[PDB]
Amino acid sequence: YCQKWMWTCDSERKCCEGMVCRLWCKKKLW
Ligand SMILES: [Cl-]
Ligand SMILES: [Cl-]
């Protein structure tokens, strides 16, 4: 599916909508 808030993330395991990968998924400001 996609990686949720604070889940690990990488090139293939992308963060869910509204988040950005910084090793773990973080909320985007925009
Ligand atoms: Cl955050
Ligand atoms: Cl950000």
DSSP states along the chain: --B-TTSB--SSSPBPTTEEEESEEEE---
Residue with tokens 């990968």: 21
CA of 15 to the centre of ligand 1 (A): 12
Phi, psi dihedrals of residue 9, rounded to the nearest 5°: -150, 155
The whole-angstrom separation of Cα 21 and Cα 10 is 7
How many Cα atoms within 13 Å fall on the side-chain side of residue 18? Answer: 4
CA of 29 to the centre of ligand 2 (A): 5
The number of the ligand nearest the C-alpha atom of 5 reads 1
Count Cβ atoms below 10 Å from residue 15 Cβ, excluding itself: 21
Burial of residue 10, with CB atoms counted within 10 A of its CB: 0-12 exposed, 13-18 middle, 19 or more buried: exposed
Ranges of each domain in the chain: 1-30
User: Which method, experimentally, gave rise to this model?
Assistant: X-ray
Contacts (Cβ under 8 Å, ≥6 apart) of 27: 5, 18, 19, 20
Contacts (Cβ under 8 Å, ≥6 apart) of 12: none
**Adjacent-strand bridge partners of 8:** 24
